[PDB]
RNA sequence: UCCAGGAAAAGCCUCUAAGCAUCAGGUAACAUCAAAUCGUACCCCAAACCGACACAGGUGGUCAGGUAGAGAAUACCAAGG
RNA sequence: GGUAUCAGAAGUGCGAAUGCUGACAUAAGUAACGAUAAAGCGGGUGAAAAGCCCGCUCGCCGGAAGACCAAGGGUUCCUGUCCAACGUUAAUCGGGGCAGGGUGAGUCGACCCCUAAGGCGAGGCCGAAAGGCGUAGUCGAUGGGAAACAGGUUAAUAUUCC
RNA sequence: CGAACCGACUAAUGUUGAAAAAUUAGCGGAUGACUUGUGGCUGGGGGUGAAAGGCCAAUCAAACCGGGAGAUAGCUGGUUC
RNA sequence: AAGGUGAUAUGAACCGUUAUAACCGGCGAUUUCCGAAUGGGGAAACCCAGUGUGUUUCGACACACUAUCAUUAACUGAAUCCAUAGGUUAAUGAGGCGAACCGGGGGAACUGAAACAUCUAAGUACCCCGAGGAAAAGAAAUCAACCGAGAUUCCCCCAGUAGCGGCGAGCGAACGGGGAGCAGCCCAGAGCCUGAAUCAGUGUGUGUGUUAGUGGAAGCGUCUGGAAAGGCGCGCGAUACAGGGUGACAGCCCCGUACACAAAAAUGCACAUGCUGUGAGCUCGAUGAGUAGGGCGGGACACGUGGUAUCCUGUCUGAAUAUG
């Protein structure tokens, strides 16, 4: 493929917020802590080799940390990435482990 | 197994080394288990090995 | 700035009047152009005076050979 | 009233602080005597 | 540095028990040595806070300096202030001044 | 209508040069793929901004209901606060 | 931890310099609690309610004291919690503390094409050095270039999700 | 003529203020040498100035910051058992 | 080398005990984005392209190169035959940081003179350029005084002397002497001979340092006290009683300690070497012109034009050439 890129790991954890089960209609979607810098293209294929699931689009933005922590007074942000991506309806979890 | 090993395998086969042993990172860490007792983290106690090989494979250049 | 053959100045000096000023002075040497070579011909080089006549003594290429090596 | 301050980033450039610093043998001058001569965390840019 | 091993048996010195047994010891590279004829009886809180809200009043450890009765074999003491030679190719730890490596 | 006589460049349309020379390109119809990456929360005539303050001050633009009224005045009210 | 003695060397002795730093007085439990758009009551919760939640009244603003956005701010947003410090009082309450959650775009914006003022500027012209000016050219919006609406929905997102 | 908007003629209050120039009631301009957002250009003996030595970040008969610097002080103060 | 996964906190999950677990030292591998930042731009850590690549489910991902100057090389190449100007490519190299000392270009004022212009402060502050490990200076167109010394530099004297100076304030030498250190050589050119000493960059070796380390002595008892290193009794080491630490002050408890050993590798300096370039040595020659002087204006010499020598000069002139 043009698997030529960084496949290797775009995605990677899952969310388990209160969003995940509430945002489940005509096709389960889903988060993962994706990189700070995966794009969308490859966050779709990513979950095609792996997964193995049909996804339709994906959207993701970034979400950032923020907090004050230190031996007096100092402490910074975190920074993230989430990303919905849809799959399908025909295709559910299937064999494998949710958490 | 892992760890310093095969040091001279020219006929080198380092690829989707990484992503096969995924399971953690990639699944299991998501939640609960990725080894919650019986042999937790491996990562970092093992599966670091990551450097050596393709270390390896960098140092293989002058072939 | 220039007479290129030669140095130059534009070194500064103290304009003493009667008795003194602790003022300052310059600039100095001039400029012109336009030297026909023998050879080839001019490339006008901004020599000066001392630059001017020292290009009479000596040649107009050896007075060239330097701005040109070095 | 209008107490002399009134903040805009882009306006904080070349006209003032900022990167504009390594443009001029003082602006370059400045960061030496300020990082260096006593370690600055420094932040200039944000 | 301390080369005193596990296992070790050693004897109080110094002061507070002394002339105790212990041996074993837990003590490590710039680390503690427990011993076992060290330890004044303590106790612990709740700190778990949780249904298993335990304790722990009974044996601790009592650090006290690698300065104890040097492993000893007759009588006590005995420094240890010699080196074997030929012998391992990593250690060649010797013993006591009184005979040899033991 | 007047005198004080009122940006620029690109996209856009068009004309040809070199070049092309059954080709490529051009126009239209539809079929399909692509449209990446950042921002997006909340305050915003103010308790989140400029004034040391949960400061009777300062801060650009947008929207513009009813009765009365010349009215974006003013008074009483809607939605709302 | 200190140091007779005789000797040696001093950052060698404070009450003042409208001296410097810190701590504590005094006035004094005095003034003041920030727009004169005042609020009353019944429930709830709670150790305690004039102030918080619910309800009915009452009053105030309404070219706004409403709504939206830019600038700037940079989690202040929503939920749960806790009340030391912070709120000019009390505080169960908050823009406070600690946790979590929360901003989803081919059509909105920035990137991006284009250039304004102006900036920078190969070579170049100048100038003790630093450096100044400027041709090609390259940046620079506050201006010109392409395309979406109406319902619905979240505790919090929305011409982004359906 | 008169709202917005721009400005400040008068009085009271404030003067350890709500406020390091404002609040209240009046007041002047309000299609113009008008008013305002954004960004740009002029630098200290220098700028800008419908001119007051006015303005150049609560600083101006020569800005702020660092340096020469422990300037100089025939003056004032203080000087320890 | 028996432990160990840096710290504020364990804890979890673990790695190790013999010899590739730690940990220390050497050489490497990797080393995002920004920053001389160098592909172009840019409010620094962001944005956009060209041209090549591999794996390619063979659109792509990222990767890699592409700044500007200078030297040389070759190729192209205007007005104009030529030739240049210009252009392209390529290999070298620079560029930026940097504390002080150092050379150099530019250069104050407060201050003092009990005012202030000469004068001082001071060629200090500062700003700019450059280079080294030191820099700079340096083998007499030096000085001396009829005797002689013999490159530069740094130290003590000569001396607060001579002298300069509104002869004010103040500035302030040298000859000569005592020392640290101590060497002189090249081109200005041909021939003979002819790769010879001398250096420079480099691969190597040895010495001796730098980067981990190794061994390293000899104490029991009893007393007081929570605790002994302290009291008291006796005993031993000492080329070690520097010091630190240990539950009160320890030579003999621990780290050390004098002393005695030690380096795969990597480098500093030395010597030695090979390679490359350099060029020794003998003979006979040659012997630094816009220069030395000088007129004008200045600056530097302790020396403020003074009677002012000498040095550098902006500006204008301008010689002899070693019986010079």
């Known amino acids: 493929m043009i698997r030529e890129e960084r496949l290797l790991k775009v995605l990677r954890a899952p969310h388990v917020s209160e969003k995940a089960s509430t945002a489940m209609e005509k096709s389960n979607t889903i988060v993962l802590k994706v990189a700070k810098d995966a794009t969308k293209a490859e966050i779709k294929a990513a979950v095609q080799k792996l997964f193995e699931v049909e996804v339709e689009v994906v959207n993701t933005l970034v979400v950032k940390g923020k907090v004050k922590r230190h031996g007096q007074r100092i402490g910074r942000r975190s920074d993230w990435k989430k990303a919905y991506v849809t799959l399908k309806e025909g295709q559910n979890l299937d064999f494998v482990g949710g958490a | ?63 | 700035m220039k007479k290129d053959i030669h140095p130059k100045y534009e070194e500064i000096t103290a304009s003493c009047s009667c008795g003194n000023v602790m003022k300052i002075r310059s600039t100095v040497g001039h400029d012109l152009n336009l030297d026909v070579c023998s050879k080839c011909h001019p490339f006008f080089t901004g020599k000066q005076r001392d630059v001017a006549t020292g290009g009479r003594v000596d040649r107009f290429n050896k007075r060239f050979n330097i701005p040109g090596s070095k | ?46 | 540095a301390a080369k005193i091993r596990r296992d070790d048996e050693v004897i109080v010195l110094t002061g507070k028990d002394k002339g105790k047994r212990g041996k074993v010891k837990n003590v490590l590279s710039s680390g503690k040595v427990i011993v076992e004829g060290i330890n004044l009886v303590k106790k612990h809180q709740k700190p778990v806070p949780a249904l298993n809200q335990p304790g722990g009043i009974v044996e601790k450890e009592a650090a006290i300096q690698v300065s104890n009765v040097a492993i000893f074999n007759a009588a006590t003491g005995k420094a240890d202030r010699v080196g074997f030679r030929f012998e391992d190719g990593k250690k060649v730890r010797f013993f006591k001044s009184n005979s040899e490596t033991i």
């Open chain 4, 1 to 46: 009233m209008k107490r002399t301050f009134q903040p805009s980033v882009l306006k904080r450039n070349r006209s003032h602080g900022f990167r504009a610093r390594m443009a001029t043998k003082n602006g370059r001058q400045v960061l030496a005597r300020r990082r260096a001569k006593g370690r600055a965390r420094l932040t200039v840019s944000k």
């Open chain 2, 1 to 63: 197994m892992k760890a310093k090993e095969l040091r001279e395998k020219s006929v080198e086969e380092l690829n989707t080394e990484l992503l096969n042993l995924l399971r953690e990172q990639f699944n299991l860490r998501m939640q609960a288990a990725s080894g919650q007792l019986q042999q937790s983290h491996l990562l970092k106690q093992v599966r670091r090995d990551v450097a050596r090989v393709k270390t390896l494979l960098n140092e293989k250049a002058g072939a």
